A paper describes a structure:
RAS is a major anticancer drug target which requires membrane localization to activate downstream signal transduction. Phosphodiesterase 6δ (PDE6D) has a beta-sandwich immunoglobulin fold which contains a hydrophobic pocket capable of binding to the farnesyl group. PDE6D binds to and sequesters the lipid of cytoplasmic RAS and has been proposed to deliver GTPase to recycling endosomes, which is followed by release mediated by the small G-protein Arf-like 2 (ARL2), allowing RAS to be trafficked back to the plasma membrane. The resultant lipid modification increases the affinity of RAS proteins toward membranes, where it is required for signal transduction. Here, we present a novel strategy for targeting RAS by stabilizing its interaction with the prenyl-binding protein PDE6D and disrupting its localization.
Two cocrystal structures with the fragments identified in the screen were successfully obtained: compound-1 in a ternary complex with PDE6D and WT KRAS peptide and compound-2 in complex with PDE6D alone. In the crystal structure of the PDE6D:compound-2 complex, four copies of PDE6D are present in the asymmetric unit. This fragment, similarly to compound-1, also binds within the PDE6D cargo-binding pocket but occupies two distinct binding sites. One binding site, normally occupied by the side chain of W90, is located at the entrance of the PDE6D-binding pocket, where the fragment forms a hydrogen bond interaction with E88 and packs against W90 and V80. The second binding site is deep within the PDE6D-binding pocket, where compound-2 forms hydrophobic interactions with residues M20, L23, L38, L76, T131, and V145, as well as a weak hydrogen bond with Q78. Comparison of the PDE6D-binding pocket in PDE6D:compound-2 complex and the ternary complex containing compound-1 demonstrates that compound-2 forms limited steric clashes with the KRAS C-terminal cysteine residue when bound at the entrance of the PDE6D-binding pocket. The compound-2-binding site deep within the PDE6D cargo pocket does however overlap with the farnesyl group of KRAS and will compete with KRAS binding. Compound-1 showed no competition with KRAS in either experiment; however, compound-2 did show competition with the KRAS WT peptide. Finally, we cannot exclude the possibility that compound-2 binds at a different site or with an altered conformation when KRAS is also present within the binding pocket. Overlay of the two complexes containing compound-1 and compound-2 shows that these fragments are within close proximity to each other with a distance of 4.8 Å between the two closest atoms.
Residue numbers in the entry: 0 to 110, 117 to 150
Amino acid sequence: AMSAKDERAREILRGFKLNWMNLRDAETGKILWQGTEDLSVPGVEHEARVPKKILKCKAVSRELNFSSTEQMEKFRLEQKVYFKGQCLEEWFFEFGFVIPNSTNTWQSLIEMMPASVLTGNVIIETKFFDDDLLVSTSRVRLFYV
Ligand SMILES: c1ccc(CNc2ccccn2)cc1
């Protein structure tokens, strides 16, 4: 007993997949982190170990490679950054239209505390949308190594 929008969300998600993601120091271009696991799955608790060095980056370039079986009118993300239950930062990134059964690459440019304190204390709540239709919600805990 599920809505029209509920069914469209169900379809998109099932037909969606995160292939890989990299993180480069915008300044140099040196890849600081490449992820293989799909961190877009809701319900699961993901974790990530990222090099401490990154916290001394003024800006970082984040590339996502994903595959969607379903067509999407405007694919965009909302991300809140939580420290010990307190939201510190919110961000919005748009990819736009997605071709059905396409594999797309998405590069976003992103413009401070001690690593000892942040490590394991930071959660990145990620909402996936088609235009203004919430398809999935993901939560990733970050560690600085
Ligand atoms: C989906 C897409 C992108 C992110 C971004 N989170 C991360 C993950 C690892 C390191 C830094 N940030 C989370 C979920």
